[PDB]
């Protein structure tokens, strides 16, 4: 054993997925006013399987002739949650090397 | 495909109110 | 044994977290009339406990519904009303929910400081004799 | 009593400590990946507590190891 | 945290209750044979050590 | 022996308010 | 003479008491919001005497409780925890220097 | 100030005469 | 010995907390014609003291009501009205209670700054020489 | 004794014509008590 | 020569004086709201001389508002930070006296 | 002690001879 | 600006003449 | 039941005790070797 | 002194 795949766990992939998720939410907020755009959601378990997709969000309310299915209340909350979890993933993956370096150097 | 249209007040209307030009409303489906 | 402070501070973090979740549910269901008059939502509150048989951990002993009477409203238009046109609403008081939000957040972050400072004392202990 | 019993007792003390440190490290690793994968039954407070204890536990392991090696290096530089 | 948060919260909550009591009187201006309800505040000291 | 009760605003007001359930208090 | 007790002094027992006090102070901070919980105090002089060779003290509230019954003054608890951490750091420095001086004399380095 | 007796609980009576 | 500073700032912070609670009660009981036992509420004020004969800690030595007369109001139909139809209300003045709220809070926070700064000075003394 | 004491805050920082401080407390400020 | 007096100079005494000054300044801040309390000052030159060879009142800039208190918190804050910087600088001076003294005796 | 200071105990009163009599 | 005699308490009279 | 203070004190006591017995053993052996290598 | 500065004692 003793390999980076096992030392880092899955925290090496989660940081990437949280970046992709943040990009999609940023797209949804920007495309909220453009008619005909369908809100895109990212399935977390899919990138989990890709580590070891880009779906559509069904609206809770009807459109108003635009056909745009973006709820700005939902997007802000989902962007806040993703950003908080992204920082935790950096903390988890960052400490993997800090412990790894301390084991090797002994100091 | 590319999807587009007029945003804001004009699009957030029932189709009976023909504020949106006819060809622009076509773009709101799909294009390539 | 080597981390007694962490078990107590951490228990407070878990305890104060439940109180914030309960507050969120009370505010999100302050206008949920639901149906009937006994299935109506009622303000829930966690119960903290300390067993003093060193350190005394804080343990949540379950969620308990408030004993305040339901807020009655006259509305013989809602189809879920009753004979006298009354819809009973949850006994959630906004002012007490705001105070709980302030108390829970500050107390939760206070235990973060104690737990964080407790680690520093442990780290300094390892430097004894060096 | 013999000297082997004291040596075995010292050996079991070291083995018990290593298992305790290893138990904390594995416990922290599971809690980290449980919260990282997106499980809603795991609290960030418990995860930070878990990795705080594992980090302190391993740091204690490093200190004992260095003292053992330094004593051995001191031992080999002796008149005999 | 300071117990003054709850001391002021308990006063703010009661002021709302007195407001609702006065609101019922104004909702019942035209009611027949209706006696208006009086509202006041009572000071109850927290006796104990300190 | 335990010391249990609802924390927060529901217990930091005079008992005449009667919000806490009797059993819990 | 030439013994670890006569060499370390009371700096070995003091460290244990300071960690005990921090456990008591942290308990009061955690149990601040629990109604009916009474703040717990620790006597350093008695604890140090017991540690050297080898009961419940409660803290009188400055003001009455708001009804819950909890007598934890979180303003005082933080101040005592800050003081306890400083004095504990000094005790580690005092005790740590006892071993360094002993090693220095037994090796002449 | 430290004591051996636990501090007494506050009363906050609605009416002092009732006690 | 900077540990004395901790006692002085801690005693000051305790005194400000007592003053804040006194202000909180005055604002809440500025409109109460009744009372718990039998006596109309009068604006309370903590008494600070300095036992000057080093450091001089500040200690609260008791609560003293304001000597301003109670504000008499003409409420002749009130149940508690006297022979002339007057009811008496607490002498709490809003303007001075608000100033106490501002003054006590700002005084409380600056004593935390001194204790935090004094805490650092003790730490740098520990690191002196090494 | 030689102890100085009184009511702090907005009540004391007023001209004595207000007479909002009890005379017992007001002398206590002086230092005689 | 070669004495701890001649080796540390006045640096071994300035640390104690500035600790006393911090105590006097700190109690001025705490007793700011106490009515009738007169702000107390410390004379550094006199106190340093006393320590080397083994408290006054502060005149107000403006009249008090009626509480008899002559504590100007803007002055107390300003003097506290200056003392803290000088106290830290004093420890640097005194601390290096020992380290240089240790360097000479050990030759390293 | 300060004169006129309030007390933290219920105020002995009139009705219920119990208070009017016991000091 | 340090003196060995405490500064005098300020006087706020309403008439000055009476003082 | 144990804390880091007890572990660190135990580590320091063992280090001081081990360093003490090694140096005294070294001193005695050096004294023995000096006596053996002398002109009779 | 300032030519016309107010005093601080009763006039």
From TrEMBL, chain A:
<comment type="similarity">
    <text>Belongs to the flagella basal body rod proteins family.</text>
</comment>
<keyword id="KW-0975">Bacterial flagellum</keyword>
<keyword id="KW-0969">Cilium</keyword>
<dbReference type="InterPro" id="IPR006300">
    <property type="entry name" value="FlgB"/>
</dbReference>
<keyword id="KW-0966">Cell projection</keyword>
<protein>
    <recommendedName>
        <fullName>Flagellar basal body rod protein FlgB</fullName>
    </recommendedName>
</protein>
<comment type="function">
    <text>Structural component of flagellum, the bacterial motility apparatus. Part of the rod structure of flagellar basal body.</text>
</comment>
<dbReference type="GO" id="GO:0030694">
    <property type="term" value="C:bacterial-type flagellum basal body, rod"/>
</dbReference>
<dbReference type="GO" id="GO:0071973">
    <property type="term" value="P:bacterial-type flagellum-dependent cell motility"/>
</dbReference>
<comment type="subunit">
    <text>The basal body constitutes a major portion of the flagellar organelle and consists of a number of rings mounted on a central rod.</text>
</comment>
<keyword id="KW-0282">Flagellum</keyword>
Automatic annotation (TrEMBL), chain E:
<feature type="domain" description="Flagellar basal body rod protein N-terminal">
    <location>
        <begin position="8"/>
        <end position="35"/>
    </location>
</feature>
<comment type="similarity">
    <text>Belongs to the flagella basal body rod proteins family.</text>
</comment>
<protein>
    <recommendedName>
        <fullName>Flagellar basal-body rod protein FlgF</fullName>
    </recommendedName>
</protein>
<comment type="subunit">
    <text>The basal body constitutes a major portion of the flagellar organelle and consists of five rings (E,L,P,S, and M) mounted on a central rod. The rod consists of about 26 subunits of FlgG in the distal portion, and FlgB, FlgC and FlgF are thought to build up the proximal portion of the rod with about 6 subunits each.</text>
</comment>
Automatic annotation (TrEMBL), chain K:
<keyword id="KW-0282">Flagellum</keyword>
<comment type="subunit">
    <text>The basal body constitutes a major portion of the flagellar organelle and consists of a number of rings mounted on a central rod.</text>
</comment>
<keyword id="KW-0966">Cell projection</keyword>
<comment type="function">
    <text>Structural component of flagellum, the bacterial motility apparatus. Part of the rod structure of flagellar basal body.</text>
</comment>
<dbReference type="GO" id="GO:0071973">
    <property type="term" value="P:bacterial-type flagellum-dependent cell motility"/>
</dbReference>
<keyword id="KW-0969">Cilium</keyword>
<comment type="similarity">
    <text>Belongs to the flagella basal body rod proteins family.</text>
</comment>
<dbReference type="InterPro" id="IPR006300">
    <property type="entry name" value="FlgB"/>
</dbReference>
<keyword id="KW-0975">Bacterial flagellum</keyword>
<protein>
    <recommendedName>
        <fullName>Flagellar basal body rod protein FlgB</fullName>
    </recommendedName>
</protein>
<dbReference type="GO" id="GO:0030694">
    <property type="term" value="C:bacterial-type flagellum basal body, rod"/>
</dbReference>
TrEMBL record, chain L:
<comment type="subunit">
    <text>The basal body constitutes a major portion of the flagellar organelle and consists of four rings (L,P,S, and M) mounted on a central rod. The M ring is integral to the inner membrane of the cell and may be connected to the flagellar rod via the S ring. The S (supramembrane ring) lies just distal to the M ring. The L and P rings lie in the outer membrane and the periplasmic space, respectively.</text>
</comment>
<comment type="similarity">
    <text>Belongs to the FliF family.</text>
</comment>
<protein>
    <recommendedName>
        <fullName>Flagellar M-ring protein</fullName>
    </recommendedName>
</protein>
<comment type="function">
    <text>The M ring may be actively involved in energy transduction.</text>
</comment>
């Amino acid at each position: 054993a003793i390999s980076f795949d096992n030392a880092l766990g899955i925290h090496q992939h989660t940081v990437g997925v949280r970046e992709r998720n943040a990009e999609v939410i940023s797209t949804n907020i920007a495309q909220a006013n453009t008619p005909g755009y369908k809100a895109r959601g990212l399935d977390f378990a899919k990138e989990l399987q890709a580590a070891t997709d880009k779906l559509y969000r069904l609206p809770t309310q009807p459109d108003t002739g635009d056909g745009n299915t973006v709820d700005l209340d939902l997007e802000r909350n989902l962007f806040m949650q993703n950003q908080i979890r992204h920082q935790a993933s950096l903390d988890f993956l960052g400490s993997k090397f800090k412990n790894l370096t301390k084991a090797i150097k002994g100091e | 495909n590319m999807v587009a249209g007029i945003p804001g007040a004009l699009s957030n209307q029932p189709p009976a109110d023909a504020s949106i030009p006819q060809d622009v409303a076509q773009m709101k489906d799909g294009s390539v | 044994s080597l981390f007694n402070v962490f078990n107590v501070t951490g228990s407070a973090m878990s305890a104060e977290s439940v109180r914030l979740n309960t507050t969120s549910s009370n505010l999100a269901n302050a206008d949920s009339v639901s149906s009937s008059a006994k299935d109506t939502y009622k303000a829930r509150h966690a119960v903290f406990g300390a067993e003093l048989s060193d350190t005394v951990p804080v343990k949540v002993m379950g969620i308990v519904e408030s004993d305040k009477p339901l807020s009655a409203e006259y509305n013989p238009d809602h189809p879920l009303a009753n004979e006298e046109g009354y819809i009973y609403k949850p006994n959630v008081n906004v002012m007490e929910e705001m105070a709980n939000m302030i108390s829970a957040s500050r107390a939760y972050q206070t235990n973060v400081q104690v737990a964080d400072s407790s680690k520093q004392m442990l780290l300094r202990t390892l430097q004894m004799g060096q | 009593a013999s000297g082997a019993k004291v040596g075995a007792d010292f050996n079991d003390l070291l083995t018990k400590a290593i298992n305790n440190v290893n138990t904390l490290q594995k416990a922290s690793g599971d809690l980290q990946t449980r919260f990282d994968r997106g499980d809603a039954d795991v609290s960030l407070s418990d995860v930070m507590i878990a990795r705080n204890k594992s980090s302190v536990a391993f740091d204690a392991t490093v200190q004992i190891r260095n003292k053992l090696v330094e004593a051995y290096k001191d031992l080999m530089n002796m008149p005999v | 945290m300071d117990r003054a948060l709850f001391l002021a919260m308990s006063g703010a909550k009661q002021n709302m209750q007195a407001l609702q009591l006065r609101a019922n009187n104004l909702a019942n201006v035209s009611t027949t044979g209706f006696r208006a309800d009086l509202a006041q505040a009572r000071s109850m000291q927290a006796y104990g050590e300190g």
